[PDB]
Amino acid sequence: DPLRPVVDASIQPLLKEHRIPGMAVAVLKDGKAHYFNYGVANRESGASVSEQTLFEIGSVSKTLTATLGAYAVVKGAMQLDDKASRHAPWLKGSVFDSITMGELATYSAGGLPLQFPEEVDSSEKMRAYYRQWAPVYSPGSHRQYSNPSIGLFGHLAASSLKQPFAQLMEQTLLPGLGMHHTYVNVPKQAMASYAYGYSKEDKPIRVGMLADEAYGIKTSSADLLAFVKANIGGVDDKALQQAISLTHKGHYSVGGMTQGLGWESYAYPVTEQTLLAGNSAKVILEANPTAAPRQVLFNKTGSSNGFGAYVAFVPARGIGIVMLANRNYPIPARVKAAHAILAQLAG
Ligand SMILES: [Zn+2]
Ligand SMILES: [Zn+2]
Ligand SMILES: [Zn+2]
Ligand SMILES: [Zn+2]
Ligand SMILES: [Zn+2]
Ligand SMILES: [Zn+2]
Ligand SMILES: [Zn+2]
Ligand SMILES: [Zn+2]
Numbered sequence: 275d276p277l278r279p280v281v282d283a284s285i286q287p288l289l290k291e292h293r294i295p296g297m298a299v300a301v302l303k304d305g306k307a308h309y310f311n312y313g314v315a316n317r318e319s320g321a322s323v324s325e326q327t328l329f330e331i332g333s334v335s336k337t338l339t340a341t342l343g344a345y346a347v348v349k350g351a352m353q354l355d356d357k358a359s360r361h362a363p364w365l366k367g368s369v370f371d372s373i374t375m376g377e378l379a380t381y382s383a384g385g386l387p388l389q390f391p392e393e394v395d396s397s398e399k400m401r402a403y404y405r406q407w408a409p410v411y412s413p414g415s416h417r418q419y420s421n422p423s424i425g426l427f428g429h430l431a432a433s434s435l436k437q438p439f440a441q442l443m444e445q446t447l448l449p450g451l452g453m454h455h456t457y458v459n460v461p462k463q464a465m466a467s468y469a470y471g472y473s474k475e476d477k478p479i480r481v482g483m484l485a486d487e488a489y490g491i492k493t494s495s496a497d498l499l500a501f502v503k504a505n506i507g508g509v510d511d512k513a514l515q516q517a518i519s520l521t522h523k524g525h526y527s528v529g530g531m532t533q534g535l536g537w538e539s540y541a542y543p544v545t546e547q548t549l550l551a552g553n554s555a556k557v558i559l560e561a562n563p564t565a566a567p568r569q570v571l572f573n574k575t576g577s578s579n580g581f582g583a584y585v586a587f588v589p590a591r592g593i594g595i596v597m598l599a600n601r602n603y604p605i606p607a608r609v610k611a612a613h614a615i616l617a618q619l620a621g
């Protein structure tokens with residue numbers, strides 16, 4: 275493969291520095307998929323990573339959940355400016371009478387935290403948590419990246435379509451996107467393809483409330499590259515195509531990053547500095563005020579215990595990259611490697 279040396283040059287240093295057991299990389303250019311596989315999915319079996327290996331992609335799941343939400347909008351089941359309690363009777367009489375579905379989707383409802391409190395570990399406790407939650411910021415004014423926020427968005431989008439979230443994803447949305455090996459619940463027949471994650475102590479590990487919606491997808495580099503293709507070349511189904519397009523619209527910005535539904539976007543060519551800043555600890559962990567929204571690059575990071583994922587693509591240039599690893603290695607390393615490889619592809 276004439277792209278192998280370029281991809282290897284940016285990826286092999288990551289593997290060495292962070293002792294990454296395995297990584298599946300996929301690149302799109304000129305309508306063609308290219309797969310570059312490294313190391314092992316499972317240190318016990320020694321099974322090689324391939325483009326069919328399943329990795330936990332963590333928050334990259336949010337792009338898929340966002341697409342389901344957009345699909346519900348396209349189907350007329352909900353609108354982004356609906357109050358959240360329209361789709362959850364159990365939220366009636368709370369502050370979620372005054373917070374919109376779009377605000378949940380874009381982490382801007384007013385300071386919902388990164389994670390549920392550890393104690394919130396059941397349906398009953400989760401409903402209680404939202405009903406007692408006290409806003410920190412006015413709706414729309416601040417971005418605080420949040421699993422409870424987008425998790426609730428996805429959960430309520432599923433409810434608006436009158437089906438369970440996992441079923442909608444596995445039976446309708448994901449196969450509609452050409453993603454037939456993408457799961458919230460990995461079935462028996464797919465378990466042999468499922469990597470283990472590796473913690474910092476090299477312990478094998480795999481993945482709470484709204485996990486499915488917020489961070490629970492297992493998928494392959496082949497399936498995720500198919501999703502990238504869907505986000506560039508499109509899909510056959512008109513409703514899904516319109517849904518995908520809704521996920522590209524900018525809602526607001528934080529520095530040089532523009533927040534949409536799931537995807538976070540940048541003007542392209544993008545400097546490494548701009549891409550690092552929008553993916554920085556400050557943006558991920560702290561509340562930041564929302565500013566007016568901005569060729570475009572779209573991306574999403576995701577991590578779980580033992581896993582580290584990144585996807586970035588540029589529709590105007592027909593290029594994209596997926597990097598799925600079974601080590602949670604630092605986001606800036608992901609960004610720098612992707613930026614370098616994409617720049618080589620862009621020419
Ligand atoms: Zn090489
Ligand atoms: Zn190739
Ligand atoms: Zn065993
Ligand atoms: Zn529910
Ligand atoms: Zn299928
Ligand atoms: Zn597949
Ligand atoms: Zn589940
Ligand atoms: Zn677009």
Ligand SMILES: [Zn+2]
Nearest residue numbers: 376377380525
């Ligand atoms: Zn919005």
Ligand SMILES: [Zn+2]
Nearest residue numbers: 543544545546
């Ligand atoms: Zn650049």
